[PDB]
Amino acid sequence: TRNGRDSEAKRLGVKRFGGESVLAGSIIVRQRGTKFHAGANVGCGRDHTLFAKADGKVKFEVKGPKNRKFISIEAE
């Protein structure tokens, strides 16, 4: 046959969920596209990884006219 190949898993997914206290610089989700968009206090890395810029609790919300999922770091 010609179907024996496959690639190693990339271990994506949400790494820190909502209402979790995190330190600055910690990865929140590893994604391929921009499935979740960066909100307040969250930056977008080279491979679309959303990372916290300040210490606080993770906040998920749906915003915008396109109903996009935003991740922000609530103040703490």
Add this chain to the structure above:
Amino acid sequence: GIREKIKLVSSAGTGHFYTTTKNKRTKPEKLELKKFDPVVRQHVIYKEAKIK
């Protein structure tokens, strides 16, 4: 892999050099760029040279 690698030697007289690749068949002219030279701590002109 027709793209072969070269080195950019600094014009500041120091032995420092960057390294990169180029397609020598479609771009025969030499490469010249301004890059940071950490020995003199200034951005100087680097010129393409033979990788050897």
Add this chain to the structure above:
Amino acid sequence: AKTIKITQTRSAIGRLPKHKATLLGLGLRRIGHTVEREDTPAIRGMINAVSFMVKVEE
């Protein structure tokens, strides 16, 4: 303090890990063992979680 009596009625040999952990949380150790616990929602949920194998009298 409005306590209730819980009595284990069946064995814990083939039960789930979560079920065994629930039984340990209730403090039951063997068949027929009776303990007395406070009547709170947490204790009520643990009883409802393993209701097939425990009997609560009030």
Add this chain to the structure above:
RNA sequence: UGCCUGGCGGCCGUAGCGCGGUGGUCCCACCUGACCCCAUGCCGAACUCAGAAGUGAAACGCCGUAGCGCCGAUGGUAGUGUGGGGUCUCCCCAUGCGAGAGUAGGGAACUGCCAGGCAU
């Protein structure tokens, strides 16, 4: 404090289309002219400047309208965690959660700050 207009939001279709009507004192838009500021891989169409003769025609705003899009119960169905059972490819019982689709229905947005014009 009432109406209308402009700018920035909250919210992201109960907020969007379509049909009919309506608006120029102010605002906004089309409009007039282009040596100059600036611009067209050609073109003052766009972008830009200097202005107010004309019109709300287009666009845009407001009002009305259920032809759509959209939201949407209650009840039932499917699925399922735990324990048990059968005729065991698949189901049933006790208990907990409970859709999607569809039905009655809802629906022509609501709201905050500032400025201008018209009345009190």
Add this chain to the structure above:
RNA sequence: UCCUCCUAAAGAGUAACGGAGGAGCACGAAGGUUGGCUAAUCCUGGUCGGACAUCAGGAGGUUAGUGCAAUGGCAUAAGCCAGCUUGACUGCGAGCGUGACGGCGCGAGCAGGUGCGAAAGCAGGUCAUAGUGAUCCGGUGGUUCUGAAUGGAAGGGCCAUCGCUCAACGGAUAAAAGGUACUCCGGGGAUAACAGGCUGAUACCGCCCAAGAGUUCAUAUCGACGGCGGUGUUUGGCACCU
């Protein structure tokens, strides 16, 4: 060896000689910044012009495009066009992700200097994920770091970098194909051939419906298109016994 989807049971991970496809590159602009723009497809009209070139208007709303496979993204466009340029910088890095480890990946911010923009700012390569090779040995450049009595030097170190389809891709060596019925040893029923076991695709023997062959008439005897079993019975499947 590496990448994408499913298998994968709604966090991560997850196997088979499972189902499908790709990579061993490319780019001095196809990278960075500032400013601007919106496709695919179809209808109508128009000289050569045609189903399809370029032009004008309309419908449509991303079904298009991304240097390439697939998936996830993308209108503030990551897609397309133009001006200026090298942040495809040097030393670092709070804190995480993924690995048994070697390692791989994301990262605000600090110091020096740079590009675009009036500026807020953005820029440590490319929309992201494949585009790859540890160590030893050796080559080139820089640096008194070291230098076997001393001063040099050779050699070695450090920094930058080169040479392996080492493709059996964590690479036994710089270097390697066959025969044994002339054989031989240590083991395994962990594993095949015989026979036994489970199952019955295949084999054999029945049964359900009845278009038709039988001059007419399905069922005297056969019976197409299809369906349901029995036996263990041929060739098998598995590797449970030796």
Add this chain to the structure above:
RNA sequence: UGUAACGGGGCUAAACCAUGCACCGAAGCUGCGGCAGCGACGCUUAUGCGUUGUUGGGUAGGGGAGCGUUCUGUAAGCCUG
């Protein structure tokens, strides 16, 4: 190869369905007595002793404590014609 598709004998219930009350049934649970491990607690600890919970199936394996055998010191001692 022989009944050989209730384990058998046999059963018109001694089968099946629904309801109810008994009883049998294990090294499960309870009673009585005994041994040992680990934690609370107190004694005046002989550094382990009352009470008190609770534990005690077990291969590869890990930990702890012992019995017995030959020889050396104790030992020209002690037992034995």
Add this chain to the structure above:
RNA sequence: CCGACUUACCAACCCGAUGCAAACUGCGAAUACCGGAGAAUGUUAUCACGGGAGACACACGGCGGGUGCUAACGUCCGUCGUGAAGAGGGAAACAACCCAGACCGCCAGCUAAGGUCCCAAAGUCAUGGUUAAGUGGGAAACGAUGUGGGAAGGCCCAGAC
């Protein structure tokens, strides 16, 4: 050149109705997973470091599947239970199924799964039904005035079968 009509022919796009998808999603659970707070229970059961390992052949059963014939006591994963490494009672016998975890002794008691006519311990127990096949005590498509219960329907003392 334009064309002419209709022909048991096929047929794009759009509209209405109806299905299918692991590699389809304008919807969408239960579970599972991460984090915070609280009470009770558990011999710290949790984590870090150091000394010593063994193991890297797994098996079956339930649930979710790939592959095979929706074959196999087949094979490969996830998760739980048991065996491995686990005795006792039941399923005749029967590592893996059901009930249940053996420190030791007793000629004591209560129950679980499973049973209560005899082997063989316990109901020839009570009330109301069904079966006539030894069905119970092995199986399908299909065939049949077997038989018990329930709600309707068509013909009928203008006479039903």
Add this chain to the structure above:
RNA sequence: UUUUGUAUAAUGGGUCAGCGACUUAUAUUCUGUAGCAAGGUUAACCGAAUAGGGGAGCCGAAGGGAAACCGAGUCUUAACU
């Protein structure tokens, strides 16, 4: 004994008695115990001698860096919040 699993119709043993398998030397790490303690300890050898002498050496109380070198700090870097 080996196994997922053996009464297994898988291996081994006819039986009895005797013998038969984690030892020894030298280094290294960890645990317990004894001595001394910022110190501990000697090896060959001398010695009539398991005493005593012998401190040659080793480990420790300081590390960072490849190194010169610096030092409770050091390395990177022109320099580090």
